[PDB]
Amino acid sequence: PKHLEVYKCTHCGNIVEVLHGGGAELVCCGEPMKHMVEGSTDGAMEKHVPVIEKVDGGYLIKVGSVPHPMEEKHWIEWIELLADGRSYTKFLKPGDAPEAFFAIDASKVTAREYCNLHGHWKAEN
Amino acid sequence: PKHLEVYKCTHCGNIVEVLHGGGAELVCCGEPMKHMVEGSTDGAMEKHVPVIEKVDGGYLIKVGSVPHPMEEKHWIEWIELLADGRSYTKFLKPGDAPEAFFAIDASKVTAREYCNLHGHWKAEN
Numbered sequence: 001p002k003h004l005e006v007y008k009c010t011h012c013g014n015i016v017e018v019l020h021g022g023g024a025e026l027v028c029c030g031e032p033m034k035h036m037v038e039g040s041t042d043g044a045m046e047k048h049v050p051v052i053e054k055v056d057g058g059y060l061i062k063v064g065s066v067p068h069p070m071e072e073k074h075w076i077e078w079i080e081l082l083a084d085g086r087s088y089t090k091f092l093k094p095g096d097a098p099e100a101f102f103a104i105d106a107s108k109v110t111a112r113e114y115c116n117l118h119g120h121w122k123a124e125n
Numbered sequence: 126p127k128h129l130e131v132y133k134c135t136h137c138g139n140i141v142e143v144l145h146g147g148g149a150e151l152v153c154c155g156e157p158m159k160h161m162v163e164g165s166t167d168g169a170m171e172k173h174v175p176v177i178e179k180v181d182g183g184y185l186i187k188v189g190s191v192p193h194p195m196e197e198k199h200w201i202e203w204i205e206l207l208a209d210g211r212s213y214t215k216f217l218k219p220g221d222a223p224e225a226f227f228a229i230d231a232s233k234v235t236a237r238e239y240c241n242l243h244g245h246w247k248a249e250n
């Protein structure tokens with residue numbers, strides 16, 4: 001695995017992000033975990049592709065162009081902003097708005113969000 | 126595993142942070158990965174316990190009260206700030222200063238850092 005990749009065990013639901021990679025395959029419930037490739041699980045561009053807005057002092061990330069549901073069984077678990085050596089993650093819960101603001105100084109950012117049912121998606125500045 | 130716990134495979138070096146837990150044991154190189162419990166690997170309080178300074182607009186995290194080495198074979202791989210549903214991580218490389226600033230609005234924070242040789246450490250505001 002590679003730094004910052006997200007892996008999920010399809011059997012039990014564990015999901016991890018790689019902080020230091022280069023080793024063997026991560027395993028869980030006897031099977032290699034699945035690499036959650038961004039946009040890999042064709043869901044709803046309108047509702048899953050993060051929308052990146054530059055605002056005072058940082059960025060407002062909204063998922064998506066159309067608000068994505070935030071229900072008990074279908075919600076955006078987190079929104080992660082990637083920029084110059086940083087990973088800033090806001091974990092969200094059902095009932096929250098599918099948006100996150102991060103105070104960060106950087107003109108180039110990558111935004112990723114993960115939907116419990118729909119998988120991993122990203123967008124770039 | 127539990128949300129935000131860090132696991133390392135002692136065999137191959139993979140290190141991951143749990144984003145969604147509650148499943149089976151994470152496995153790598155045929156053995157369950159090791160849970161890197163903060164302050165669990167008694168190293169150097171002076172050099173591993175993060176020092177948390179509140180400054181304009183956020184926090185400056187320094188590892189530690191005495192600067193920790195940042196050499197090719199012994200360095201702080203990242204500094205992570207935990208506060209109200211957020212995980213903000215700055216990944217560091219040899220040659221960098223063992224410090225990180227995060228622009229965040231919150232009076233209660235937890236700072237963790239990971240030293241390649243010394244393991245996982247934290248401190249609270």
Ligand SMILES: [Ca+2]
Binds near residue numbers: 089
């Ligand atoms: Ca993070």
Ligand SMILES: [Fe+3]
Binds near residue numbers: 011029
């Ligand atoms: Fe599993």
Ligand SMILES: [Fe+3]
Binds near residue numbers: 048115117118
């Ligand atoms: Fe969805």
Ligand SMILES: [Fe+3]
Binds near residue numbers: 023024134138139154
């Ligand atoms: Fe391994």
Ligand SMILES: [Fe+3]
Binds near residue numbers: 173193240242
């Ligand atoms: Fe050390």
